[PDB]
């Protein structure tokens, strides 16, 4: 009730990770969770999406099979969801049991700080030497007229039936992944975005290639399209832009970012520093401004990814409970995959970023090609790759790929980039043939040198 | 006739590569080819096999689709053959045109040395300052009774119709790849192997997992099985082990190694050292014992891979024609993929090799799991992975993976291993989630420690 070494607020990626490691160092751990263990990722994030992603991968596969002489003949969405939910349910079940197995005290409900070192959960108060905030986020629904006519990614994973005509508002990760899933399943898919290109945070080569692939797949896009309101039309719902432009959808999905769950956490009661956008500032070691209070995962405003939350959690527990006083996560060169169809992946800096952060010091290599996966198909999606290099030695500061296999391609490259790999390091590595990844180690002439 | 800077013998991976780079450095280049440009890889190796591998990936995708709610569905082999060959043709055509574009003097026919710096092709003699031998290999057909009833991998890519009941003799690369192609196309396949495990050269964990995957997909295997002869039976041909065991097959495929094309090459006449197995010894810079004569690719008896022949050739051209007098290929840690279903991949040393070369100093990490690719399927193939580490610092000396995605997974890991990555280097890099590769950077407790 006061004798806990650790209270982890939130049983998602970060909370589970720090609770787990702490418990393994023989600490007394309390874990607070208002909903289901596993958090966003297991329930409404990474896992349901990747399961649905395989279904779309397999659907593309049955379309392309006759081209290779494989005689194949459409989605049963209820069966997909049922299978997906059984699988997700099993991971929830694992975690429920694992937490009990570790000896962690689970507390159901919504935790709020009551002071610098105590929380209250449905009237019950609990103190600890260390309180870790890992409450994650939730999808943003804009304060616009008729915004409630649209659903979010949470709503997407709740859908019991496949919608026929979809509008996706936002072209970040989830907007693009949702678009690719649904079009692959044969829905009409339009995506709209504020920006002049899809996947704005990513390198212009990936953005451009993705657009081509998406256009080729029949996905309608509208760039520089600000949604002013959503309205009800004759059997369906309509998007209304700034200028008055109208768009008959049976589903409109808001994919315009996520907000941190820090609104009534009692942070002011505890004197915890928090930004106007709800992000909780931390140092490199997840320390907030209040000693004994830490934040990790999405609410910290750094790379919004599951393995980032986990790693941040494990290292924090190592720091606090294993006397590894200098232990921290490195937030440079975190690899990521966007599960489009075909998917994309990157580690490190895009060209514009590297040009921002470093000078006119960039040597940039790139290539485009149709992979052998589509050799016997009519119009396969193009693969595109860019190596961003910096300095005379050509340190590789960015690796960017879009195309078949990209989802499994960059993990090892992330290792090399973290080790400070140069172009030479890549080039002295013998290719694997035949495949796509070999293209990253056989780039010859650069497209841009310092001066461009 | 004698004013050539380079004669490349063989228009395969090594010959093309050295000729191209020499030509690019403004040298006068002759390229001798007796058959088609592109060599083995383009015509009867990597490319046809990978084309068919995709058909096989798609057939499996077709099988698995209903489990994921995708309402699907059987191979039209002629359609596959026609598509494959058309794709192959384009690459040959590219090379034909490319060699002409580079200004290389192509010469059709079989080259033999006449002296240390001269070759003869169908009567014409040609000298050069530099002669690169890159004549590659050919499948081995053993000198057993009725060996000729079987076919080779060359014969596999010549087949116009899908065989119904196939025997694969050999559990190296080719045997395994072919077995997996055929089985997913619905043929009956049994593979026999001299060794006690499939893919002997590979790490036991890969071998053991591949056996499991292959058994689960209906492939029958016979280990420690030495075929003594092939005889005709009542429709089909039979395998006879030397103990007497008998196996009725539609086609029998020898996949028992490849022999170097160096028997009728005039190496005697030029004074070039050759081993009894036909391999041509070289130093680290591809130099034979006679100055001006070099060898690369398969006949050198090093890693028998396309990109290895290519890199060796390019680097040799840089050495010879661009004053980069120290340029050579590093033969340590060549990554490779074996295109089974699902494929496997490795870079560096297996556990047995590492103990053999480095001693009782290994920290070995292992994991095994069913990837999310098979989440809604009944019995997906296993994925298995091993990190082989050496020393107290735990340098990564071996990386090994079998399973979905293995074919695109290890290229970047090869770079890291090339740089001398340790386990710490792996663990300090954040995982990509969700996927399989992340398992390689999140291996916690080792299975074996020094001792
Ligand atoms: C659709 C979608 C797809 C995604 N795909 C990927 C992907 O493929 N790869 C990847 O790496 N990342 C992906 N992410 C991001 C990833 O899910 C998050 O980065 C990760 O879950 C963050 O973990 P966390 O611990 O910070 O927050 P969460 O995992 O969301 O955990 C927070 C938990 O705390 C609980 N909680 C909140 N407030 C309280 C309270 N005050 N008291 C008690 N409990 C509380 C919540 O119920 C929640 O369970 C995806 C996200 C979305 C939405
Ligand atoms: C079935 C199979 C699958 C394979 N799969 C892969 C794989 O996926 N990945 C990979 O990296 N490697 C693979 N390989 C191995 C790869 O093909 C070889 O390592 C590569 O082709 C070797 O190149 P090379 O230049 O040494 O020989 P080759 O490419 O075989 O070139 C030799 C050429 O020389 C010609 N020649 C021979 N004698 C003479 C003569 N005296 N005069 C003139 N010309 C002559 C031949 O016609 C031939 O064209 C595979 C091989 C096989 C057979
Ligand atoms: N595969 C993965 O690793 C994975 C998958 C999904 C999400 N994630 C994580 O979760 C986060 C989720 O971000 P997100 O994709 O929801 O959004 P985002 O922040 O990445 O993108 C913002 C988008 O909102 C749009 N937008 C905002 N207001 C608009 C308006 N009124 N009209 C039209 N468009 C408007 C903009 O056009 C913009 O494209 C990501 O940052 C990522 O880190 C990861
Ligand atoms: N994916 C790729 O990178 C790829 C694919 C295929 C081949 N290759 C290359 O080509 C080379 C040749 O491959 P390979 O598989 O033909 O050779 P191999 O040396 O790997 O095959 C040896 C096999 O021959 C068998 N064998 C020999 N005599 C036998 C007997 N009488 N009875 C039963 N079994 C017998 C053994 O059991 C053994 O399994 C490889 O070294 C490889 O580098 C590469
Ligand atoms: Cl236990
Ligand atoms: Cl409440
Ligand atoms: Cl909240
Ligand atoms: Cl896909
Ligand atoms: Cl030109
Ligand atoms: Cl002849
Ligand atoms: Cl010969
Ligand atoms: Cl496969
Ligand atoms: Ni207490
Ligand atoms: Ni107090
Ligand atoms: Ni001459
Ligand atoms: Ni002479």
HEC profile of B300-324 = HCCCCCHHHHHHHHHHHHHHHHCCC
Q: Where are the beta strands (DSSP E) in A10-56?
A: 29-33
State the Cα–Cα distance between residues A335 and B430, nearest whole angstrom: 7
Q: How many helices (H) and strands (E) does chain A have?
A: 11, 20
Those residues whose C-beta lies under 8 Å from the C-beta of residue B427, and which sit 6 or more positions away, are B441, B442
Task: Say whether B434 and A46 touch across the interface (CB within 8 A).
Answer: yes
Which helix or strand (DSSP H or E) is residue B87 part of? helix B77-102
Of all residues in chain B, the one with the smallest CA distance to A47 is: B434
Q: Mind giving me the DSSP string for A250-270?
A: SEEEE-S-EEES-TTS-TTTT
Residue A452, both tokens: 């461009």
State the Cα–Cα distance between residues A213 and A381, nearest whole angstrom: 5
**Residues in A 386-415 with any Cβ partner in B closer than 8 A:** 405, 407-415
B243 alpha carbon, closest ligand = 4
Task: Say whether A308 and B430 touch across the interface (CB within 8 A).
Answer: yes
**Backbone phi, psi, residue A287, to 5°:** -70, 130
Q: How far is CA A23 from CA A6, A26, A98, A106, A285, in A?
A: 9, 5, 11, 12, 19
Q: In terms of C-beta density within 10 A (0-12 exposed, 13-18 middle, 19 or more buried), how is residue A232 classed?
A: exposed
B373 — contact with chain A (CB < 8 Å)? yes
Closest C-alpha to ligand 3, atom 4? A173
Which helix or strand (DSSP H or E) is residue B365 part of? strand B362-369
Is B170 close to ligand 2, i.e. is its CB under 6 Å away? no
| Fold matches, B1-139+257-332 and B333-444 | no
- Angle of helix B77-102 relative to helix B13-24, nearest 10 degrees, comes to 30
Task: Give the domain ranges of chain A.
Answer: 1-139+257-332, 140-256, 333-444
Shortest Cα–Cα distance, B53 to chain A (Å): 9
The CA-based dihedral angle spanning residues B170, B174, B177, B179, taken in that order and rounded to the nearest 10 degrees:
-40
CB B42 within 8 A of CB A46: no
Which helix or strand (DSSP H or E) is residue B5 part of? strand B4-9
CB A241 within 8 A of CB A230: no
Those residues whose C-beta lies under 8 Å from the C-beta of residue A235, and which sit 6 or more positions away, are A248
Task: Say whether A47 and B434 touch across the interface (CB within 8 A).
Answer: yes
Those residues whose C-beta lies under 8 Å from the C-beta of residue B385, and which sit 6 or more positions away, are B366, B367, B368, B400, B401, B402, B403, B439, B440, B443
| CATH, domain range B333-444 | 3.30.390.30
**Backbone phi, psi, residue A171, to 5°:** -125, 35
Closest C-alpha to ligand 1, atom 51? A45
Among the partner-chain residues A57, A307, A421, the one whose CB lies closest to the CB of B430 is A307
Distance between start and end Cα atoms, chain B: 64
Residues of chain B with C-beta less than 8 angstroms from the C-beta of A41: 433
Residues of chain A with C-beta less than 8 angstroms from the C-beta of B308: 430
Q: Which residues of A383-406 are buried (b: 16+ CB within 10 A; e: fewer)?
A: bbbbbbbbeeebbbbbbbbbbbbb
- Picking from B345, B246, B196, the residue whose alpha carbon sits closest to that of residue A405 is B345
Is beta strand A124-133 parallel, antiparallel or unpaired with respect to A118-121? antiparallel
Q: What sign does the dihedral A430-A432-A434-A440 (CA atoms) show? A: negative
Is B43 close to ligand 2, i.e. is its CB under 6 Å away? no
Domain B1-139+257-332 has CATH 3.40.50.720: no
- Picking from A344, A255, A232, A261, the residue whose alpha carbon sits closest to that of residue A14 is A261
Beta-carbon neighbour count of residue A168 at 10 Å?
27
B80 — contact with chain A (CB < 8 Å)? yes
Topology at the third CATH level for domain B140-256? FAD/NAD(P)-binding domain (3.50.50)
- Under the phi-then-psi rule, with left for phi > 0, alpha for psi from -120 to 50, and beta for the rest, what region is B323? left
Q: Which long-range contacts (CB under 8 A, 24 or more apart) does A193-200 make?
A: A193/A169, A193/A221, A193/A222, A193/A223, A193/A224, A193/A225, A194/A224, A194/A225, A194/A226, A195/A171, A195/A223, A195/A224, A196/A223, A196/A224, A197/A223, A198/A171, A198/A223, A199/A171, A199/A172, A199/A173, A199/A338, A199/A344, A200/A171, A200/A172
Is beta strand B251-254 parallel, antiparallel or unpaired with respect to B165-169? parallel
Q: Where are the beta strands (DSSP E) in A159-249?
A: 165-169, 188-193, 220-223, 227-233, 236-241
The pocket around ligand 1, CB under 6 angstroms, is made up of: A 9-15, 32-35, 39-41, 44-46, 49, 110-111, 134-136, 153, 174, 261, 265, 297-298, 304-307, 309; B 433-434
State the Cα–Cα distance between residues A53 and A55, nearest whole angstrom: 5
DSSP class of A149: G
State the Cα–Cα distance between residues B53 and B45, nearest whole angstrom: 12
Beta-carbon neighbour count of residue B264 at 10 Å?
9
Residue A50, both tokens: 């990747």
- Picking from A328, A385, A311, the residue whose alpha carbon sits closest to that of residue A351 is A385
B432 — contact with chain A (CB < 8 Å)? yes
- Picking from B366, B426, B367, the residue whose alpha carbon sits closest to that of residue B396 is B426
The CA-based dihedral angle spanning residues B32, B33, B39, B42, taken in that order and rounded to the nearest 10 degrees:
110
Query: How far is CA A14 from its chain centroid?
Result: 14
CB A205 within 8 A of CB A400: yes
Q: Mind giving me the DSSP string for B101-137?
A: HHT-EEEES-EEEEETTEEEETTEEEEEEEEEE---E
Place of tokens 């088609």: B36
A123 alpha carbon, closest ligand = 6
The percent helix, strand, coil of chain A (3-state, each to 5) is: 35, 25, 40
3-class DSSP state for residue B417?
A: helix
Sheet holding A188-193, edge to edge: A220-223, A188-193, A165-169, A251-254
Closest C-alpha to ligand 1, atom 53? A45
CB B6 within 8 A of CB B19: yes
Among the partner-chain residues B64, B337, B434, the one whose CB lies closest to the CB of A58 is B64
Task: Say whether B375 and A437 touch across the interface (CB within 8 A).
Answer: no
- Under the phi-then-psi rule, with left for phi > 0, alpha for psi from -120 to 50, and beta for the rest, what region is A151? beta
3-class DSSP state for residue B246?
A: strand
- Dist. CA B7 → ligand 16 center (Å): 14
Residue B202, both tokens: 């590979």
Residue B238, both tokens: 């039979």
CB B298 within 8 A of CB B283: no
Those residues whose C-beta lies under 8 Å from the C-beta of residue A43, and which sit 6 or more positions away, are A35, A36, A88, A92, A157
Q: In terms of C-beta density within 10 A (0-12 exposed, 13-18 middle, 19 or more buried), how is residue B193 classed?
A: buried
Residues of chain A with C-beta less than 8 angstroms from the C-beta of B333: 430
CB B292 within 8 A of CB B312: no
Place of tokens 């045997």: B175
Query: How far is CA B20 from its chain centroid?
Result: 23
Distance between start and end Cα atoms, chain A: 63
| A contact test, residue of B412, B414, B416 with most A CBs within 10 A | B412
Q: Mind giving me the DSSP string for B247-283?
A: --BSEEEE-S-EEES-TTS-HHHHT----TTS-----
B103 alpha carbon, closest ligand = 9
B329 — contact with chain A (CB < 8 Å)? yes
Task: Say whether B432 and A414 touch across the interface (CB within 8 A).
Answer: yes
CB B261 within 8 A of CB B297: no
Task: Say whether B58 and A73 touch across the interface (CB within 8 A).
Answer: no
Return the ∠ at Cα A423 (arms to A420 and A426), rounded to 5°. 85
Q: Looking at the CA of residue B298, tell me the nearest atom of ligand 2.
A: 26
Residue B445, both tokens: 């407790």
Beta-carbon neighbour count of residue A332 at 10 Å?
12
Q: In terms of C-beta density within 10 A (0-12 exposed, 13-18 middle, 19 or more buried), how is residue B313 classed?
A: buried
Residue tagged active-site, from B110, B117, B341, B433: B433
CB A214 within 8 A of CB A222: no
CB A312 within 8 A of CB A16: no
Half-sphere exposure of B24 (CA within 13 A, CB side): 13
Shortest Cα–Cα distance, B230 to chain A (Å): 32
Return the ∠ at Cα B246 (arms to B243 and B251), rounded to 5°. 125
Residue B290, both tokens: 């006679």
Residues of chain B with C-beta less than 8 angstroms from the C-beta of A64: 58
The percent helix, strand, coil of chain B (3-state, each to 5) is: 35, 25, 40
Q: Which ranges in B194-240 belong to alpha helices (H)? A: 204-216
3-class DSSP state for residue B144?
A: coil
Return the ∠ at Cα B328 (arms to B322 and B332), rounded to 5°. 160
3-class DSSP state for residue B345?
A: strand
B40 — contact with chain A (CB < 8 Å)? no
A421 — contact with chain B (CB < 8 Å)? yes
Beta-carbon neighbour count of residue A162 at 10 Å?
19
Those residues whose C-beta lies under 8 Å from the C-beta of residue B93, and which sit 6 or more positions away, are none
Shortest Cα–Cα distance, A62 to chain B (Å): 6
Q: How was this structure determined?
A: X-ray
- Picking from A165, A339, A161, the residue whose alpha carbon sits closest to that of residue A252 is A165
- Dist. CA A301 → ligand 1 center (Å): 13
Place of tokens 């340190």: A395
Residues of chain B with C-beta less than 8 angstroms from the C-beta of A47: 372, 434
Q: What sign does the dihedral B367-B371-B377-B381 (CA atoms) show? A: negative
Q: How far is CA B108 from CA A10, A126, B37, B98, B136, in A?
A: 73, 86, 10, 16, 16
Pairs of CB atoms within 8 A across A/B: 275
- Dist. CA A91 → ligand 5 center (Å): 18
B75 — contact with chain A (CB < 8 Å)? yes
Facing residues of A165 across strands? Answer: A188
Which helix or strand (DSSP H or E) is residue B81 part of? helix B77-102
3-class DSSP state for residue A131?
A: strand
- Picking from B367, B427, B421, B361, the residue whose alpha carbon sits closest to that of residue B391 is B361
3-class DSSP state for residue B83?
A: helix
CB A401 within 8 A of CB A409: yes
């Amino acid at each position: 009730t006061q004798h806990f070494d650790l209270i982890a607020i939130g049983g998602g990626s970060g909370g589970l990770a720090v609770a787990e490691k702490a418990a393994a160092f023989g600490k007394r751990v309390a874990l607070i969770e208002s909903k289901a263990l596993g958090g966003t990722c297991v329930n409404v994030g990474c896992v349901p999406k990747k399961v649905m992603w395989y279904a779309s991968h397999l659907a593309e596969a049955v379309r392309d099979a006759p081209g290779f002489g494989v005689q194949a003949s459409t989605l049963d969405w209820p069966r997909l969801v049922a299978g997906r939910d059984r699988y997700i349910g099993a991971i929830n079940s694992f975690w429920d049991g694992y937490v009990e197995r570790l000896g962690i005290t689970r507390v159901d409900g919504h935790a709020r700080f009551v002071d610098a070192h105590t929380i209250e959960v449905e009237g019950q108060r609990l103190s600890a030497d260390h309180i870790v905030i890992a409450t994650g986020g939730r999808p943003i629904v804009p304060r616009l007229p008729g915004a409630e006519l649209g659903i979010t990614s949470d709503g997407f994973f709740a859908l019991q039936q496949q919608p026929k005509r979809v509008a996706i508002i936002g072209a970040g990760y989830i907007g693009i992944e949702l678009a690719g899933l649904l079009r692959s399943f044969g829905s009409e898919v339009t995506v709209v975005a504020l920006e002049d290109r899809l996947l704005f945070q990513f390198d212009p080569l990936l953005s451009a290639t993705l657009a081509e692939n998406m256009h080729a797949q029949g996905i309608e896009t509208h760039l520089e399209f600000a949604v002013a309101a959503l309205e009800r039309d004759a059997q369906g719902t309509t998007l209304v832009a700034q200028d008055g432009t109208r768009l008959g959808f049976d589903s409109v999905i808001w994919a315009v970012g996520r907000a941190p769950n820090t609104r009534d956490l009692g942070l002011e009661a505890a004197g915890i520093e928090v930004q106007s956008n709800g992000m909780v500032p931390t140092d490199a070691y997840q320390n907030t401004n209040v000693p004994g209070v830490y934040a990790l995962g999405d609410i910290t405003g750094r790379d919004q990814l599951t393995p980032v939350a986990i790693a941040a959690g494990r290292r924090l527990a190592e720091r606090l409970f294993d006397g590894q006083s200098e232990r921290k996560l490195d937030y440079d060169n975190i690899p990521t995959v966007v599960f489009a169809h075909p998917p994309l992946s990157k580690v490190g800096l895009s060209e514009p970023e590297a040009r921002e952060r470093l000078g006119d010091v960039l040597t940039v290599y790139e290539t485009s090609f149709t992979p052998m996966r589509y050799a016997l198909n009519e119009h396969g999606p193009k693969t595109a790759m860019k190596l961003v290099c910096a300095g005379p030695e050509q340190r590789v500061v960015g690796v960017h790929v879009i195309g078949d296999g990209a989802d499994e391609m960059l993990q090892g490259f992330a290792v090399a980039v973290k080790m400070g790999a140069t172009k030479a390091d890549f080039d002295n590595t013998v290719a694997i043939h035949p495949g796509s990844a070999e293209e990253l180690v056989t780039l010859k002439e650069p497209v841009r040198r310092p001066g461009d």
